[PDB]
Amino acid sequence: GTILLDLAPEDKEYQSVEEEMQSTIREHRDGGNAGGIFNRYNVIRIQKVVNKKLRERFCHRQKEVSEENHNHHNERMLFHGSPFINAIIHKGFDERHAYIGGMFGAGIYFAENSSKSNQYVYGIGGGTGCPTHKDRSCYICHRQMLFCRVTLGKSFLQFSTMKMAHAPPGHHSVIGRPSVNGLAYAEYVIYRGEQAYPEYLITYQIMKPEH
């Protein structure tokens, strides 16, 4: 099964991960309603998810994809946030838990910006916030997000992704690109759980802006 390996802060691997997270905090047009109001995170833990079988599934799919993508599996490190993280780190991603509805198709979404994924830690639009205080901007409760290896293969670009069940023929992923009457940032979508490996499990808190 899965083994979570704690990384130490002096480890350069820890420092890269936290830097990518801290440096990708972006401005969201919702006044912080979904993910809360914060300028930085308090990263309190970064664990490496080690799962032999899960890795083998990932690499096997990566091979299939590469052969259909002129030998480029096109892997990318991206963020993912959702209430399913504990289940994911133990069994791997599962597209069976992805449904068409609202602004999303039946795929698993990833973001280049940590702050975007933070908006989904407690559910779509931040849900009702943390379980304990029902505060989307809770500075107390610990949140978790994943920094994963994502096999994109041949990506199909489009503006809306809310009605997708699978990637278009010949493709392995879909990228929702920004538009004036639509998305603010790009969203990476896969429709097969095995196209993502939850490399790092980040435990953190958003920090209140300093006075």
Ligand X SMILES: O=C(CCSc1nc2ccccc2c(=O)[nH]1)N[C@H]1CC[C@H](c2nnc(-c3ccccc3)o2)CC1
Residues of each annotated binding site: 130, 133, 138, 141
Pair type for strands 187-190 and 173-176: antiparallel
| Sequence-separated (6 or more) residues with CB below 8 Å from residue 87 | none
Contact (CB, 8 A) for 50 and 3: yes
Choose, by CB under 5 A, the member of 130, 189, 196, 201 that binds Zn ion.
Answer: 130
Choose, by CB under 6 A, the member of 14, 38, 41, 110 that binds ligand X.
Answer: 110
To ligand X, the closest distance from the beta carbon of 174 in angstroms equals 12
To Zn ion, the closest distance from the beta carbon of 142 in angstroms equals 9
Per partner kind, with CB cut-offs from 5 to 8 A, the member of ligand X, Zn ion, none near residue 116 is ligand X
CB atoms within 10 A of CB 108: 24
For 68-210, where are the alpha helices, taking DSSP H only?
85-91, 114-118
Q: Is 39 helix (H, G, I), strand (E, B) or coil?
A: coil
The CA distances from residue 63 to 37, 55, 66, 72, 76, in Å, are: 41, 12, 5, 9, 15
To ligand X, the closest distance from the beta carbon of 145 in angstroms equals 7
Counting contacts by CB under 6 A, is residue 124 touching ligand X? yes
Per partner kind, with CB cut-offs from 5 to 8 A, the member of ligand X, Zn ion, none near residue 140 is Zn ion
Spell 83-107 as b/e; 16+ CB within 10 A means b: ebbeebbeebbebeebeeeeebbbb
Residue range at the interface with Zn ion (CB under 5 A); choices 100-108, 130-138, 177-185, 195-203 = 130-138
Q: Position 21: which residue type? A: M
Counting contacts by CB under 5 A, is residue 89 touching Zn ion? no
> Which is closer to Zn ion, CB of 86 or CB of 128?
128
Q: Contacts with ligand X: how many residues (CB under 6 A)?
A: 23
Site residues (vs Zn ion, CB under 5 A): 130, 132-133, 138, 140-141
Site residues (vs ligand X, CB under 6 A): 79-82, 84, 87-88, 91, 93-94, 97-98, 104, 108-111, 116-117, 120, 124, 187, 193
